Design an enzyme around this catalytic site. Structure first.
Site, mmCIF file in Angstrom:
data_model
loop_
_atom_site.group_PDB
_atom_site.id
_atom_site.type_symbol
_atom_site.label_atom_id
_atom_site.label_comp_id
_atom_site.label_asym_id
_atom_site.label_seq_id
_atom_site.Cartn_x
_atom_site.Cartn_y
_atom_site.Cartn_z
ATOM 1 N N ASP A 181 0.822 -1.217 0.000
ATOM 2 C CA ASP A 181 0.000 0.000 0.000
ATOM 3 C C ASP A 181 0.857 1.268 0.000
ATOM 4 O O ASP A 181 0.516 2.242 -0.666
ATOM 5 C CB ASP A 181 -0.940 0.034 1.221
ATOM 6 C CG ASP A 181 -2.298 -0.617 0.970
ATOM 7 O OD1 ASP A 181 -2.488 -1.334 -0.042
ATOM 8 O OD2 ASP A 181 -3.200 -0.414 1.819
ATOM 9 N N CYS A 215 -2.353 0.461 -13.546
ATOM 10 C CA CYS A 215 -2.411 0.437 -12.096
ATOM 11 C C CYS A 215 -3.581 1.353 -11.746
ATOM 12 O O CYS A 215 -4.635 1.266 -12.386
ATOM 13 C CB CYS A 215 -1.055 0.855 -11.480
ATOM 14 S SG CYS A 215 -0.231 2.340 -12.247
ATOM 15 N N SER A 222 2.968 0.997 -13.379
ATOM 16 C CA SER A 222 2.946 0.685 -14.811
ATOM 17 C C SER A 222 4.241 1.123 -15.489
ATOM 18 O O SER A 222 4.766 0.428 -16.371
ATOM 19 C CB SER A 222 1.751 1.395 -15.481
ATOM 20 O OG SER A 222 0.478 0.959 -15.012
ATOM 21 N N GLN A 262 6.728 7.686 -10.519
ATOM 22 C CA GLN A 262 6.067 8.769 -9.750
ATOM 23 C C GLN A 262 6.853 9.276 -8.545
ATOM 24 O O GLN A 262 6.520 10.357 -8.013
ATOM 25 C CB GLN A 262 4.703 8.300 -9.224
ATOM 26 C CG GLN A 262 3.586 8.287 -10.231
ATOM 27 C CD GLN A 262 2.288 7.765 -9.612
ATOM 28 O OE1 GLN A 262 2.176 6.587 -9.244
ATOM 29 N NE2 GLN A 262 1.315 8.646 -9.472
#
Ligand code: JKP
Length: 284
Positions: A181, A215, A222, A262
């Site tokens: 997570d 995703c 991804s 990211q």
């Protein structure tokens, strides 16, 4: 520089955030005007993640051809990928239309439907053999054929039927179920094992349309998947594998979709995966 020693040099100097910010500064900026039209607001999960106009996948429809999906075409590696967001309640039918129209064999899913207590994508495939799904807006039927649940991922066989023509095709669903997570995995071993299973299936090969990978936003996890795949393929193809420059490959991919990779932790994880994977390919 080579990869493994550039890696140790960034770790010892603690400069991953500065390396990652350089990538963000140098990345391409192209228009995404179709994505921002008002009629498409409920077709986008996030307002700051949009496909570029020049590389977006078009649906074969005359009313509205828009889906938040991009074609990443890697010329030297001779691989293509479609990167897309997790489907929304009002785009599940568009998603399977794309799979059909682009002749894809496989779908790669890197998220769980619920993470951090919130929904990250729609439940867009059937969970029981006897309870098939019909998408009336795009005239498709989807049936679960079989399911193989393993410790880090699940593989499903699905049948997609075009109800207009009664043609059917087999689609493979590769679902990586254990990305945490928060953060990134501690070891890349299970992610690499998963990548090799997708490869072995034929889903990445030129005799099929491009694999569809997603995703939640279709840029982070991804991006890690296609960057690791392409870098390892280039290391097999070239006379000098140490010439493969992961930052240059990432910038090339970012010409086709914004935001790939990211966080600085995702960047470091991508290096780790390519480094460990290059040892398993060989020779040894
Ligand atoms: O084909 C190429 O572009 C290429 C580039 C580099 Cl740097 N090294 C090799 Cl082996 C091939």
């Amino acid at each position: 520089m080579e990869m493994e020693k550039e890696f140790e040099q960034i770790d010892k100097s603690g400069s991953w955030a500065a390396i990652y910010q350089d990538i963000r500064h140098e990345a391409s900026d192209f228009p995404s005007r179709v994505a921002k039209l008002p009629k498409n607001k409920n077709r986008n999960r996030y307002r700051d993640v949009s496909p570029f106009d020049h590389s977006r996948i078009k649906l074969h429809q005359e009313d509205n051809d828009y889906i938040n999906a991009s074609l990443i075409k890697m010329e030297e590696a001779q691989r293509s990928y479609i990167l897309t967001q997790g489907p929304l309640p009002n785009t599940v039918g568009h998603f399977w239309e794309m799979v059909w129209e682009q002749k894809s064999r496989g779908v790669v899913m890197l998220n769980r439907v619920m993470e951090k207590g919130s929904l990250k994508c729609a439940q867009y495939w059937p969970q029981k053999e006897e309870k098939e799904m019909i998408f009336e807006d795009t005239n498709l039927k989807l049936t679960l054929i079989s399911e193989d649940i393993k410790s880090y991922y699940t593989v499903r066989q699905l049948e997609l039927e075009n109800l207009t023509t009664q043609e059917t095709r087999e689609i493979l669903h590769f679902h990586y179920t254990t990305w945490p997570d928060f953060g990134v995995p501690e070891s890349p071993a299970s992610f690499l094992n998963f990548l090799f299973k997708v490869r072995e299936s034929g889903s990445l090969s030129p005799e099929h349309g491009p694999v569809v990978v997603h995703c939640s936003a279709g840029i982070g996890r991804s991006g890690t998947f296609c960057l690791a795949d392409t870098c390892l393929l280039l290391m097999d193809k070239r006379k000098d594998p140490s010439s493969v420059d992961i930052k240059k490959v990432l910038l090339e991919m970012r010409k086709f979709r914004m935001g790939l990779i990211q966080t600085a932790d995702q960047l470091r994880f991508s290096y780790l995966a390519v480094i460990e994977g290059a040892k398993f390919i060989m020779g040894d």
